[PDB]
Amino acid sequence: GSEGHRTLASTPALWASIPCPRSELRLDLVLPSGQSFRWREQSPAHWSGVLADQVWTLTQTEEQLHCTVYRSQASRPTPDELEAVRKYFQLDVTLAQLYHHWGSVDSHFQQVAQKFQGVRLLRQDPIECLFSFICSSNNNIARITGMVERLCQAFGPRLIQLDDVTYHGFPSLQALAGPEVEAHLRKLGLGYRARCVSASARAILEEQGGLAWLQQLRESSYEEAHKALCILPGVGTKVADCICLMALDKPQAVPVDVHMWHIAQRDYSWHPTTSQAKGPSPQTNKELGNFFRSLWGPYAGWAQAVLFSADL
DNA sequence: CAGGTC
DNA sequence: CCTGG
Ligand SMILES: *CCOCCOCCS*
Ligand code: NA
């Protein structure tokens, strides 16, 4: 079929393979699990979405990540285009090695990781990540997804249309800093989060030095990146850790939420000892993150993603 | 209220 | 202070 979303069977000549066993990556545990909100399984086991400013469809067999890209002449992805996929999934980070370390120092991980292999962190764009997770407060994956989708339709550049889906790039800072964006985003149902989207776009672009300020947090320390993000409206401790882990190359960031608290007590018998408060608070949440960073090591945020994936 | 942020 | 379950 020359129209529509492709499948491995329908258009074999347009797919290229990255050697990637299923223990290193499971799309079904990584793409709909609340890292990115913009991947869809348009046909069974085939995930479509925007990757490096282009639309891709991904599906995997036992040893191979099959990829196809929609650019005007149809042809399978080139080696350079496939490298964008490897960088997005950070395939040089070997889960077999990470899982071995986490199981070595943690018996509970070793037990529950066996049925949940292939859970890894995407390397997302800071802009998309920052604003997606600004929208994540008081909100669920289903509603976040719709909010992000309508956000991208209204302000993001049109790319291509496959079947009845028009794919849009994520909006620019300039777009999100434009006139009346908050009112517009309110019409799309973002509620109070609409103000924080507009306010954070204007803050970065008009007070912080622009896109280079955000992107160069990738080179700053984790502590520096977290501090800087927390200046932005809508970015609290938890949101900043999400962005640090998922977009700013801080694999030791541990977004502490009540879900992490339940896991900390149930499976690790953890309780706070730097403070005397017994439940969630700034002080105790910080300790909880430090606790998992010394238990799991510099990739604690990835280990958390494995555990989170078990529950869901 | 529980959850996050002001 | 907001908010959705
Ligand atoms: C409970 C949220 O507090 C108000 C700040 O909102 C930040 C996202 S717009
Ligand atoms: Na803030």
Task: Classify A274 as helix, strand or coil.
Answer: coil
Is A289 in contact with A256 (CB distance < 8 Å)? yes
Q: How many residues does chain A have?
A: 312
- A192 beta carbon < 7 A from strand C? yes
DSSP category for residue A248: S
Q: What is the dihedral of CA A221, A135, A159, A119, to 10 degrees?
A: 60
- Top mutation candidate among A130, A132, A137, A257 for ligand 1, by most atoms within 8 Å of CB: A137
Per-position b or e across A52-76, b if 16+ CB within 10 A of its CB: eebbbbbbbeeebbbbbbbeeeeeb
> Which ligand ends up closest to the CA of A234?
1
| Residue A257 assigned to a binding site | yes
| Residue A32 assigned to a binding site | no
CA–CA separation, A156 vs A20, rounded Å?
32
Is A230 in contact with A279 (CB distance < 8 Å)? no
Is A188 in contact with A154 (CB distance < 8 Å)? yes
| Residue among A25, A20, A21, A19 at smallest CA distance from A302 | A25
CA–CA separation, A280 vs A269, rounded Å?
15
The amino acid that residue A213 corresponds to is W
Phi and psi at residue A64, in whole multiples of 5°? Answer: -140, 135
Task: Classify A238 as helix, strand or coil.
Answer: helix
Helix axes A282-296, A237-246, angle to 10 degrees: 30
Strands (DSSP E) found in A64-214? 64-70, 158-162, 165-168
Take atom 4 of ligand 1 and give the residue whose Cα is closest. A234
- A139 beta carbon < 7 A from strand B? no
- A195 beta carbon < 7 A from strand C? no
Is A90 in contact with A302 (CB distance < 8 Å)? no
Q: How many CB atoms lie under 10 A from the CB of residue A227?
A: 13
Tell which residues of chain A come right before a gap with C–N over 2.5 A. 71
| Residue among A55, A54, A56 at smallest CA distance from A66 | A56
Residue A238 annotated among the catalytic residues of the structure: yes
Contacts of A204 (CB under 8 A, 6+ apart): A173, A210, A211, A213, A214, A232
Q: Which contiguous run of DSSP H or E holds residue A243?
A: helix A237-246
CA–CA separation, A105 vs A165, rounded Å?
46
Per-position b or e across A255-272, b if 16+ CB within 10 A of its CB: bbbeebbebbeeeeebeb
Q: Active site residue: A87, A187, A238, A278, which one?
A: A238
Max distance between CA atoms of chain A, in angstroms, equals 65
Cα-based distances in Å from A218 to A113, A222, A224, A240: 29, 9, 10, 13
CA of A279 to the centre of ligand 1 (A): 21
- A139 beta carbon < 7 A from strand C? yes
Task: Classify A239 as helix, strand or coil.
Answer: helix
CB of A131 sitting under 6 A from ligand 1: no
- Top mutation candidate among A135, A186, A196, A235 for ligand 1, by most atoms within 8 Å of CB: A196
CB of A195 sitting under 6 A from ligand 1: yes
Tell me the technique behind this structure. Answer: X-ray
CA–CA separation, A21 vs A118, rounded Å?
9
| Residue among A66, A51, A72 at smallest CA distance from A12 | A66
CA angle A187, A193, A199 (to 5 degrees): 100
CA A16 → C1' B6, Å?
49
Q: Taking the mean position of all CA atoms in its chain, how far away is CA A159?
A: 21
Tokens 């996929």 -> residue = A85
- Token pair for A202: 């204007």
Q: How many CB atoms lie under 10 A from the CB of residue A30?
A: 20
CA of A178 to the centre of ligand 1 (A): 21
Task: Classify A64 as helix, strand or coil.
Answer: strand
Cα-based distances in Å from A241 to A116, A146, A203: 23, 23, 19
CA of A232 to the centre of ligand 1 (A): 11
Task: Using a 7 Å CB cutoff, list residues 167-206 of A near strand B.
Answer: 196
